[PDB]
Design a protein around this ligand. Sequence first.
Ligand SMILES: NC(=O)C1=CN([C@@H]2O[C@H](COP(=O)(O)OP(=O)(O)OC[C@H]3O[C@@H](n4cnc5c(N)ncnc54)[C@H](OP(=O)(O)O)[C@@H]3O)[C@@H](O)[C@H]2O)C=CC1
Ligand code: SF4
Ligand code: SF4
Ligand SMILES: [Zn+2]
Lengths: 48, 370, 176, 114, 287, 95, 95, 126, 208, 111
Amino acid sequence: EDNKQFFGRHRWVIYTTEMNGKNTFWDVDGSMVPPEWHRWLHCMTDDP
Amino acid sequence: VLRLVMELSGEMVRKCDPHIGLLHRGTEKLIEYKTYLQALPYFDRLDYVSMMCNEQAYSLAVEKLLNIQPPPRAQWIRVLFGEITRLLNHIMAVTTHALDIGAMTPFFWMFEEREKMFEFYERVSGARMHAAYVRPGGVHQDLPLGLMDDIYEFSKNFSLRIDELEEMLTNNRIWRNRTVDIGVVTAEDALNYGFSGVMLRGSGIQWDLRKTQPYDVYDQVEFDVPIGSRGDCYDRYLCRVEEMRQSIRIISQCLNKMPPGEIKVDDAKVSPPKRAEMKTSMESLIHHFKLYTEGYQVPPGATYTAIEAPKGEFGVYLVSDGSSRPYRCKIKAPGFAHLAGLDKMSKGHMLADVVAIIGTQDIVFGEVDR
Amino acid sequence: TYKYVNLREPSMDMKSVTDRAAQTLLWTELIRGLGMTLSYLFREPATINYPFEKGPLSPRFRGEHALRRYPSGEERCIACKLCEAVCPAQAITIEAEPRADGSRRTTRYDIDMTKCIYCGFCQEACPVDAIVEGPNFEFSTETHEELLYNKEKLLNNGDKWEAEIAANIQADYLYR
Amino acid sequence: TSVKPIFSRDMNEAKRRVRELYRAWYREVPNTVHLFQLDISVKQGRDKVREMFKKNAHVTDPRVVDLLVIKGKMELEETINVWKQRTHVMRFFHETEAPRPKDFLSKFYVGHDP
Amino acid sequence: LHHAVIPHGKGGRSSVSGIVATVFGATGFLGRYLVNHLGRMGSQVIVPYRCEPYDTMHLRPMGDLGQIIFMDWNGRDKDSIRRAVEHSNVVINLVGREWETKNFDFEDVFVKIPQAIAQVSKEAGVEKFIHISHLNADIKSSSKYLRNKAVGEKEVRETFPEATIIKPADIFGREDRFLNYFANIRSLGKKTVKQPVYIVDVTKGIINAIKDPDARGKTFAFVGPNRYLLFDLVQYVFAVAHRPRDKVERIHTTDRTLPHLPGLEDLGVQATPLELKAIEVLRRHRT
Amino acid sequence: ASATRLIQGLRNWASGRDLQAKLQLRYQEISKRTQPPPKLPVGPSHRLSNNYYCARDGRREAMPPSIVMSSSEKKAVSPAPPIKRWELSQDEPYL
Amino acid sequence: GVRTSPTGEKVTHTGQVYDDEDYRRVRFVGRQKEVNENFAIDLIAEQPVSQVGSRVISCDGGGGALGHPRVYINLDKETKTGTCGYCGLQFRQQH
Amino acid sequence: TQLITVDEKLDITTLTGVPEEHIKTRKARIFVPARNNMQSGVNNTKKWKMEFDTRERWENPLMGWASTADPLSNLVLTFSTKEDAIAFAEKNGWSYDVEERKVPKPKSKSYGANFSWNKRTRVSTK
Amino acid sequence: TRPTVRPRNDVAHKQLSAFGEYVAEILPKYVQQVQVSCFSELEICIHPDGVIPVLTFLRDHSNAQFKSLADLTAVDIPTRQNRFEIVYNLLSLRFNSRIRVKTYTDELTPVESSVSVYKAANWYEREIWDMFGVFFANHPDLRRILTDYGFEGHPFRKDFPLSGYVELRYDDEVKRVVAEPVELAQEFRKFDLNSPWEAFPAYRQPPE
Amino acid sequence: KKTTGLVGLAVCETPHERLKILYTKILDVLGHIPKNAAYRKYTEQITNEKLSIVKAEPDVKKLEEQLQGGQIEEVILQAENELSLARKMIQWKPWEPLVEEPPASQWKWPI
Ligand SMILES: NC(=O)C1=CN([C@@H]2O[C@H](COP(=O)(O)OP(=O)(O)OC[C@H]3O[C@@H](n4cnc5c(N)ncnc54)[C@H](OP(=O)(O)O)[C@@H]3O)[C@@H](O)[C@H]2O)C=CC1
Ligand code: SF4
Ligand code: SF4
Ligand SMILES: [Zn+2]
């Protein structure tokens, strides 16, 4: 989470590999985030 | 997408028949086989670029038949979103005119602006575009706290961005030389062929439904509708631009004089009661239940009303047997009325000018089809 | 009250007509348009890096069609058919049976996601707020069979998360 | 009980207009099979044209015969232009069976249609 | 039989018909038209495929909403094919390539494939197994293709004895091999008697034989009405097209009649001759 | 923002409108979310002892339409009086 | 907390499973028949039946305006438990 | 302009466009809709509803639904009188059955005779 | 009454009443009804012969301009010997008033083609010819708008059901899109929602 | 004036005598019409009231603000149009009584 950039570049995820065992170093997907971080990430709030 | 069959002497014309009806969807029959509150999104999305003035017209049709005045805070919020929809539809008309004529980038600048307006629709109703949100009998589920500052900041920034659009185009020499010579509209033909809206504002005679017949609190905001001079496409373009500017001024006065009145009517047989009294009453659950099963009964009669959508006289004609279903609705479409005179607009020009004529009247064909 | 455009005349002073002729011969305001476009060239672009920076939303987005259930309890629905009555697409299809507990329940509860126009009438019509327009909008379905949800797909969609939906409803139970 | 007729007074002008329309449809078919690039010989098309004329051969109200003249003339205009594509002209035919017969026995093995 | 297996009401497009058909092959020509007529009938068709799903994607939406089903198989494992034909009413064997691959000859496709799938289908217990062959595929010489089809006929008649052996003549349609091969040539001139038959009559014969009862055991052969010289047919092809080793031996073998076993007259359908449908299909000549 | 002064001056020189002032990239006045919860006021009902639904029953006040016709008269009036002609607004007219 | 069919797959909370002479089992081939494996019948029995020390009591369901509306249920059955139709949970009385 | 006009029947089944099977096979029923007995209200009376006979509605085996090949199954036409009902049904072509209207017969109920003396009418509870 | 109810303006009611009485008394040849609603928008109910004289009189005459023409819809009503209703809508540019010219018509006898006096009714007449069957006499071009070409049946009638009689699908046998008789995927439950108990006492029609 | 606000309307130069000969033709063609109607009465009334407005006006703007119909030449246009309907109302016999009634079960709305 950064504040020095504009509204839309506050919060960004970086995915790790093998979170399901599927070799996700490449081909990152949507819905690879758990839902409380889906509330936080879409800027519906200010609390992590 | 339209079909056009033009019979032409070369790089010229003789006749031009717009074959349309391709986007036909059975809307009138489908509204006949439903209730009022169920069939509201039909009137939300038959016209699709304008998205809240169509709802405002159908809500005023049902309210004008049902004899219920909404509370005044709902009226001022409805005025604010009507001006947002007017601003959005005129700026899309300008930018799709520009993109079909060439002129790549101001399309994208003003669609960044329209992305912010879809963000405002998201924060208010929740959906991206098709906010149902306007029940007949007042506006439902008022705006959350922390919005008017955003609207005010947008108003300042969009005033600067529309001035920078007027910097970009508008005294550009070759866009002017593209569209000055083409598409005159005789005032006799402007009244016979049934033109409406921006065509009437541009082609001479002074005519605004908003200033003449106040369908809501518009008589208490101070603005001036622009008039055309020579009945002409550059002149009609400048008319659209100053209608956008006066929409900004109406947003300013509306944010100045907002009352803290109420969301919906206090008529629990017409609008559903709110959730807390619904959980703890008896008549609130009874009214909720029968209002969402049957729909509220509507007295018999045939009403007509019409407001100024940004394309023109959006007319809705309700025919109601005494029941909970509309017996027959019908829609008078400004796009249909504008497209009716394509011969008398393109009697003496060529096909690029025909594309300019299709541009200078904001066709969408969701509405031109009824 | 009106304010109409284009009523002047081109001037007869030699300075004004030679300024207009200089605009004609010298491509001037074309170059001023180039200057405006370069002034928007040197801005920073407002693109969001999509799979890492997702877009902004609302507390009341209308998404996923997930059911809910009671705190440490059973299913929240009743099969009272109010959502099926209000559904304008008529995508809701309910068949009810009561179970051995005595309380009334269901058997079949199908949403045609093909037909669903995503209004909010079934969100606002449920007297116990069982069916809720979910948070996220990521469906992206290969086959045509998978866009026909059963009660078990809705309950697994509402048990993969409720704390999100509980957070949204606890945020905005006061407006609706 | 006064009714304004459309075109005709008695059945004479009705018969005259409908045989004129049949003459136009007779001289209109090979242009269509040459233009739309159909897949059917001239004989079969003319036989289904005369079949569709013989289907409604028992209506005697002259208003109704005039209104069917108007229907056929509208379709003749929109087929003599290149508006109605290959799909509609093939849609006049019925090659996509539907072989549903009119026995009693085969209507009994596929039931609920007496 | 359980419910939702009996027919219901009218025909096709979610009007549930009776049969549940598992079709082998069904990527190419005749399987595609047969799946189209079963989708017109409104049944459930289990099509398995080994190839890329793009091809079954282009032949996908012919069935209704989720009626036909796609699955996977191979020419090596009995267990995957048994998994494919676990629950089915009928099964049709339409498989075969007209050239040897690197991994499969005409050996073991016509030889190994119908024995294995007929074995596991008899172990599953299905009805009306319909197996294709060609007309006049005897034991005799000049074609590994024809002698392996003779071996396959002997196999399907030997094991699972109540199998419907079917055979058409040289069949033509929109994506034919031999008629479009005569169109896409260059040349030589010889004599051969031959009959073609248009493809919709053959597949309507197959669907009538698969839904009409008690026709099992009796092998069928589809007979065109014309039955004339190959050289006149090739001159007809060049005339309508406006332009004046294994496959060429398989078309210069012969086509003779086997009139003892019946055709379409015990089935009740029009057999369409070459003229109408050939003028229909012979587009794409000069201008 | 997040730029040096040289390219800032080039932006404000290519378009002399002071682009640094308002730029449509908001950083500060994004509305601070997780707002306090509202308490919605209720308007001209829940007023006890006077809210009579017999009074404000505008639905039942729907009169049937009054009919005038069938199957030295000083008259010939217009439907509404003619509309008074407008004027140029004082706020920047033309020319 | 699920059963398992004699065919070898999972049944639902409703006894809807197939016979051996069907084909929707063969359209279940290759892709998993989903079932919510946390039922609703057995979650009632894990709840403590509250023993409220009054006569006729109330029920809302964990939160005002978040749940089901007020139902006031009676506890006069001297050996049977009063059951909320909404909640599905029982009560007793102890004077 | 007051022309030749004949005064006869109508044959609009050629112009309504619906094919022959749905014209001549299905039979209309003109009925007054009876009172839904769990309520007691005859506002739902006073109209003549025309409906058609129902036909097959099988089970769509993918969702457990009720599909049908019946476009005419879901009509109802509300009429004001039986005379124009029969006139319309004979105008538009299809065969039909007409029933008649049944009303509540006026009784003579009285509380004072419900509290009688030497008759067997006696409420025995109130 | 004073909140939550839209008031009515009896000034405009008296004005439209006097104007409609004026028009009815000066055109006796074709006038049957001049009815005024509660919300004061005039309705004039007319025999289907004087369409062209009433429109030429209502375009001009300088006591009522009404240059503006809007919609025309002929809403289909059974249990009438003459079924359909042509609803012209007329708007004055000078006066700010709306009059609904309802002339009645039957299934077959034409009304007299208002395109000759109002140029905005061209596609209106063509469209209502396609959707209903109301013929227009001595009109230049009558084609099908808002339907398919090979389609027919005039679908905004009440005899035409909600689902059409056709259903398109592509097939590879004949390599094109063909029409079959309709096969629904769900029943389209037409619910019973007509509740009893007479919500409007002021509209009780006198029974038989 | 010079080039008024409308678009398809070329301005005039002598409005007064043109309008006066127009209204004399209005009164004459009304003079063809039978006296027993009421149309003659009401059109004679309104047109002689407007003529009496014009006889007291040698100006332009005071004529445009005593008489409505802005600005000027739409009055001449609708005068020509009213002359056109006068010519048409020699025909069409509108003073004559009603043509045959509707069947009286029709205009009763709520069905
Ligand atoms: N003249 C004619 O055309 C006649 C043809 N026939 C028969 O009709 C059938 C269809 O004809 P045609 O046009 O050639 O269509 P195909 O040759 O495409 O049909 C054969 C099927 O088998 C599949 N297949 C190919 N190689 C193998 C393999 N090694 N193992 C398993 N499956 C394989 C094919 O592709 P995929 O793997 O993608 O499924 C296809 O689905 C053939 O069996 C042919 O013998 C009979 C009489 C006359
Ligand atoms: S409205 Fe709510 S409780 Fe009623 S059937 Fe729908 S989801 Fe269930
Ligand atoms: S959002 Fe609308 S269409 Fe979707 S299920 Fe709910 S009520 Fe039906
Ligand atoms: Zn409870």
